[PDB]
Design a protein around this ligand. Structure first.
Ligand SMILES: [Zn+2]
Lengths: 155, 50, 135, 101, 85, 97, 60, 119
RNA sequence: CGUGGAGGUCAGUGACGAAGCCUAGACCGUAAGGUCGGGUCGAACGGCCUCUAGUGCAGAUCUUGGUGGUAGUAGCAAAUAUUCAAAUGAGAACUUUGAAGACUGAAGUGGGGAAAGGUUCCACGUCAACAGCAGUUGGACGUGGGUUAGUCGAUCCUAAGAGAUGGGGAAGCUCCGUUUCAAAGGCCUGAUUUUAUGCAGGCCACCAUCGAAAGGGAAUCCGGUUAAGAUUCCGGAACCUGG
RNA sequence: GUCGAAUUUGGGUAUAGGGGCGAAAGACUAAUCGAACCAUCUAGUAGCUGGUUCCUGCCGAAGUUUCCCUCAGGAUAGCAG
RNA sequence: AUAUUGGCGAGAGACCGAUAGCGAACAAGUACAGUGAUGGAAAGAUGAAAAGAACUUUGAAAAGAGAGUGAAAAAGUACGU
RNA sequence: UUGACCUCAAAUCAGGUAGGAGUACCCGCUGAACUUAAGCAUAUCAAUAAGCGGAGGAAAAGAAACCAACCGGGAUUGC
RNA sequence: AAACUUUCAACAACGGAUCUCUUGGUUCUCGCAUCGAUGAAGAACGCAGCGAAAUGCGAUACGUAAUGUGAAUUGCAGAAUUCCGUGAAUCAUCGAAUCUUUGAACGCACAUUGCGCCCCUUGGUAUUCCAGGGGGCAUGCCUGUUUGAGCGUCAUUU
């Protein structure tokens, strides 16, 4: 909130052959006489500085939230949509793919992966493995350094 | 002034000892950044204002 | 009254702020007594005070003081509450009986502006409360 | 407007009297016990010039009735008073020039 | 003659080095420092002087004693010495 | 200023309102704290039910007198009728008023 | 000629020079050097010679 | 090299005082030869050795006073606790836990009963 | 159409060369633009579907920074003035020495100080920058040396004045006041020679303190000495204060 | 011009901003004076001046009515999308 | 149960990316200005590793030309592009 | 003559205690104007900024000289 | 026809944009309560084998003691036994100390490294003078102690 305003700069007015922007006073610095307080000034304050009471979350009707979850569930049983999203279900026998309850009690990762490869998720687990790439911007060093695909959703 | 108080002469002594270039072994230290004495003073350039 | 300490009565403002003489100093005279005594003996704790006499010029009060360093006070749990650091200069902050009279600290509709603190009440109803899911 | 000059005189910054060369306050003796029952004899040591004052001042020496010392007073000179004149100050002093009846 | 010729008569220092802050702001004739208020008991500061408060506040110095209080708090103000464990 | 057909608005924003603005970013964080406090308090009073028994009571204000509501305390006459003393009832989790 | 502490006066310099080197001091002249230190000019009595104890101290 | 504190703690009051003086004699000589030799790093060890002896001497004298003032109130201020100015002015456990005889009777007659609600 | 970031996808491109930059080389679009080839380069970056914004410049005597024409131009002209030879150096109108000619002309361009400066003092080495030409020279640069007091000053006294205390105002920060409506102290003589000092006594009434390197004031002169210090060092000869 | 005095001047000291100081000019009060400098209120307000950043497509004005301490501005009807 | 632009200790972001983000990513409230209150900068990047150019030659010297190190001197402490 | 009591003093008397810093939040005092009102003085800005006094880990308030008018509720604080 | 001017390209300059980074900033959330007369925050001046600053420290001075780890520090020099260990280290931890001159700053002052009083002790043939070492001397207020003052006032005697 104090950015661009920690200075006592004042306008020089007209008659000095300079623009009427406020200027840092005093002398002997190399900063004295420079423009201040404007969005066009170096080291000034930006136009409409960002506030925290901007709206960050959005409220959606609860019944509309459930509407979209129902359609999302239904769209998971359409093999045309699943392929269109790129989920490598060409060799999958049938969808909805329902497996036995014994998957719910697997404790080790190696056994869990083997069950996934046995039912037809082999080509989709390799899809995520082969899709690891660096991010394409400054988000790399904002704790978002990597990106990859999304595999199956076990329920 | 020739007749001077002790505080002035004591600050004068400290300022005389700071009137020095960098030691030349400082530049060879690992990850050294300092290249010169950026706080050098001269009697003819800048006054102490003490 | 409290004469406004401006040189030659010049206030340099609007006419409503031109009063100099008949302004009344929201704190009581008894509060001024405990404050001036409380500075004289800073090792003590002001407990209460009462009226003894008055004339045209001065009003006279007696101040009750408690020593928080005396072992007869640090023991005797009925009185050792005054020894807590949260009770430093009760008269300065208006924690004395007359301090809460002037502060308006009381119960009811007649004290709506001052029931829990005037600054606290004003700041609470002059604040913009915004939630994550805007109401 | 601006504060006028006669208003600046009451602050007493550069309008205080110049009192560096003045001999002293020209006061009579103290009416203690001798001047109201009898008299006391003094002597005019000198007449001097007080800077800032038109009249000359007379330095008169009395004795202390209660201690062995030589209390000295500064009188405004009445003309005709000379050095070495005897001044009688008291209730029973005679009607003569320089006395303090 | 208020310009260059008048600037040649400047040899009488109005301020000298202070003892509380050592800033060369101690007025010789007022016997007061214009920065910290010496010899007054309180150090001069103001709320309109936000930069001024920032320039001499706690932490700008060595903190010869206060820099260790938090460590002594963490160990619960322990007394004695380690037992050669 | 005034302009085409619109309702007259009263936006009380002519003070330094931006100094006092509360945005509750901690709604989620403060809810975890509230539940952690209940979990920690429950252990300290480990057998006790974490709240006092409260009476049922008629509401005031004929707009609301048609309902009953949880009161504050059990009305010293009532605890005596129940066969116990208020000084003792306060010790076994009964709220007395 | 010694570099003495900046708190030591002429009395202390006399007693120390006698204590540390077992000599007699005729007079002590002290100046504060421009570098912020003190220099003592200790003149010995005619009985001793500073040359015979400068090399005894170890500097020559 | 240098002196070891665990060694110095065995020596007596006069042994350490004579030890300290000998270390001042040595460091005085090293300052003389430092003006001649280009570099004399040995002077640090003697300087640290001097500080170690004065530390052990100070501990012996301070601990002796602690025994002298043991088992009585009004010990020297630098010998007693330092914790905090506010902590030192606080009520003690005995003073904080003072209870009136009226409140003591109620605190044993009607304590908080550890009850439960299951059946 | 284009830019920063975000969710999904192309199991997209890439150290066998990403991005960026340059290219009167090529192609597509009315256009905002997109694609390709070549060079330079070194580590990340794109196509498509959506989401988000501190999202597109020729101007604002806009801000910060850099750069021209003017332009090798205006100009480097007050204070009488320089000349010859040698030495040094790579280099001499400017440095050193010698010779000659001049000036300040004792209310000086001489010899000292106060204020201010602070090491500029002196020496050795030395010319990248400074000395608006130049420079071997310098108040420049680098490295060291140098300031010695009983008698000179401060310190002490008071001046104009400043300012605690006792008090009295002021919400308070603080203001008035300097002896005021105050119970405001130590100096000499001595005495028990358990013994230190309370007692044997007498005296005393002002009254904090700060305020002058030109006011007042205890007392030092001569000769010699250093690269640079001297009424201070050395030699000799004196004086004051306290005991 | 004056040049032995209502002279010139050093140091110390006092007088501070609606205040000082002025043999008086609104002069001087640190190159600042018909009210100094500094920071903050303060991004003070401005019916007034200047500027306001990509392409293409379609449509396309007004300087007129009434009211206004209104006349360099607004509301209102009209014209346009 | 409530507040918390300070202190201490932590975890994060559809935030900024060296004319930005705090004035300050650096010996930053530093250099510097002002009598003073106060004002207040600029300034990040060789290379994986100095391996920071031995040696010859021209020059009084700075440096030049070779030679050499390096993946690259179209990276030479005036250093990524 | 002696001993009290009351009031008032002194001591480098024996133990303590206050002052300053920080001050985001807290309790008080004191207190504007810019600004809006298309001018402006009441009003507004604002019982705000600046200034002063005093705390803590929270502070304050707090167990009715309360709210109510109902079939009454029942300390304080916060949403 | 050259020179010169303008345009374009290549190479080289000037300048430091663009790209790619980032031990920094900003915002949100969570937890805790800990400055000072037992002398704080702040200041001045010093301290290293070779340092001007930053950081650290106080004449025990880039620090002493204690504990943990367990073989370094590093620009150069130096030291080696500190290497199967009460032990290296510009390490971590930190409970014992040191802590100059100051600062609310406290013997009086302070544009002065100025001027005192008291106790113990040492030297100068010294209870009085000078010097060295150690320890003290602010104000307000509170509880208590001792010594007092006031025909304020109570009993008993000549
Ligand atoms: Zn100061």
């Amino acid at each position: 909130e104090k950015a661009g305003h920690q200075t006592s700069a004042e306008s020089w007015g007209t008659g000095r052959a300079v623009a009427r922007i406020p200027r840092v006073g005093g002398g002997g610095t190399g900063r004295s006489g420079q423009g201040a307080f404007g969005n066009m000034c170096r080291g000034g304050r930006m136009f409409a500085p960002t506030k925290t009471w901007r709206k960050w979350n959005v409220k959606v009707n609860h019944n509309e939230k459930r509407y979209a979850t129902a359609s999302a569930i239904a769209a998971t049983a359409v093999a045309s949509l699943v392929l269109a999203r790129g989920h490598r279900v060409e060799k999958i026998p049938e969808i909805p793919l329902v497996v036995s309850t014994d998957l719910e009690s697997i404790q080790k990762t190696k056994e869990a992966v083997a069950a996934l490869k046995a039912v037809g998720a082999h080509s989709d687990l390799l899809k995520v493995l082969k899709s690891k790439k660096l991010r394409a911007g400054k988000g790399k060093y904002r704790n978002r350094r990597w990106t990859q695909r999304r595999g199956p959703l076990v329920v | 002034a020739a007749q001077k108080s002790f505080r002035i002469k004591q600050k004068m002594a400290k300022a005389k000892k700071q009137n020095r270039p960098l030691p030349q072994w400082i530049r060879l230290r690992t990850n050294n950044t300092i290249r010169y004495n950026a706080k050098r003073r001269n009697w003819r350039r800048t006054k102490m204002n003490i | 009254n409290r004469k406004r300490p401006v040189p030659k009565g010049a206030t340099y403002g609007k006419p409503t702020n031109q009063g100099v003489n008949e302004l009344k100093y929201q704190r009581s005279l008894r509060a001024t007594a405990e404050e001036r005594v409380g500075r004289r003996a800073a090792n003590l704790r002001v407990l209460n005070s009462y009226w003894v006499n008055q004339d045209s010029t001065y009003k006279y009060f007696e101040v009750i003081l408690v020593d928080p360093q005396h072992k007869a006070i640090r023991r005797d749990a009925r009185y050792n509450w005054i020894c807590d650091p949260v009770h430093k200069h009760r008269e300065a902050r208006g924690l004395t009986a007359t301090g809460k009279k002037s502060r308006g600290i009381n119960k009811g509709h007649k004290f709506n502006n001052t029931k829990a603190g005037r600054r606290k009440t004003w700041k609470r109803q002059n604040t913009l409360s915004l939630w994550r899911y805007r109401k | 407007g601006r504060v006028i000059r006669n208003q600046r005189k009451g602050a007493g910054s550069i309008f205080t009297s110049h009192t560096r060369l003045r001999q002293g306050a020209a006061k009579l003796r103290t009416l203690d016990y001798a001047e109201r029952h009898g008299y006391i004899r003094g002597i005019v040591k000198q007449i001097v010039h007080d800077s800032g004052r038109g009249a000359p001042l007379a330095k008169v020496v009395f004795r202390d009735p209660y201690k062995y010392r030589l209390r000295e007073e500064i009188f405004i000179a009445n003309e005709g008073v000379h050095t070495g004149q005897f001044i009688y100050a008291g209730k029973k002093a005679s009607l003569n020039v320089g006395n303090v009846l | 003659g208020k310009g260059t010729p008048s600037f040649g008569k400047r040899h009488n220092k109005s301020h000298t080095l202070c003892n509380r802050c050592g800033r060369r702001s101690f007025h010789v004739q007022k016997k007061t420092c214009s920065s910290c208020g010496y010899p007054a008991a309180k150090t001069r500061s103001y709320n309109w002087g936000a930069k001024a408060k920032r320039r001499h506040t706690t932490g700008t110095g060595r903190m010869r004693y206060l820099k260790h209080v938090s460590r002594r708090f963490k160990n619960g103000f322990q007394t004695g010495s380690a037992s050669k464990a | 200023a005034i302009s085409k057909n619109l309702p007259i608005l009263k936006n009380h924003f002519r003070k330094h309102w931006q100094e006092r603005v509360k945005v509750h970013f901690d709604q989620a964080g403060k809810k975890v704290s509230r539940r952690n406090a209940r979990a920690t308090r429950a252990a300290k009073i480990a057998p006790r039910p974490l709240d006092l028994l409260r009476p049922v009571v008629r509401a005031p204000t004929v707009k609301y007198n048609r309902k009953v509501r949880a009161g504050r305390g059990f009305t010293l006459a009532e605890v005596k009728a129940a066969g116990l003393t208020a000084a003792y009832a306060r010790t076994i989790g009964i709220a007395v008023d | 000629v010694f570099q003495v502490s900046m708190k030591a006066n002429k009395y202390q310099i006399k007693k120390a020079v006698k204590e540390l080197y077992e000599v007699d001091v005729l007079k002590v002249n002290t100046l504060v050097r421009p570098n912020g230190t003190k220099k003592a000019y200790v003149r010995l009595t005619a009985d001793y010679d500073a040359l015979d104890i400068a090399n005894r101290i170890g500097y020559i | 090299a240098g002196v070891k504190a665990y060694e110095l703690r065995t020596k007596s009051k006069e042994q350490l005082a004579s030890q300290l003086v000998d270390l001042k004699k040595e460091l005085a000589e090293l300052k003389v030869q430092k003006l001649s030799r280009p570099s004399l790093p040995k002077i640090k060890t003697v300087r640290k050795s001097i500080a170690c002896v004065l530390t052990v001497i100070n501990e012996q004298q301070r601990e002796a006073v602690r025994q002298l003032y043991k088992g009585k109130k009004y010990q020297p201020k630098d010998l007693r606790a330092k914790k905090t100015r506010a902590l030192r002015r606080a009520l003690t456990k005995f003073e904080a836990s003072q209870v009136t005889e009226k409140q003591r009777k109620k605190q044993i007659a009607f304590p908080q009963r550890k009850y439960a609600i299951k059946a």
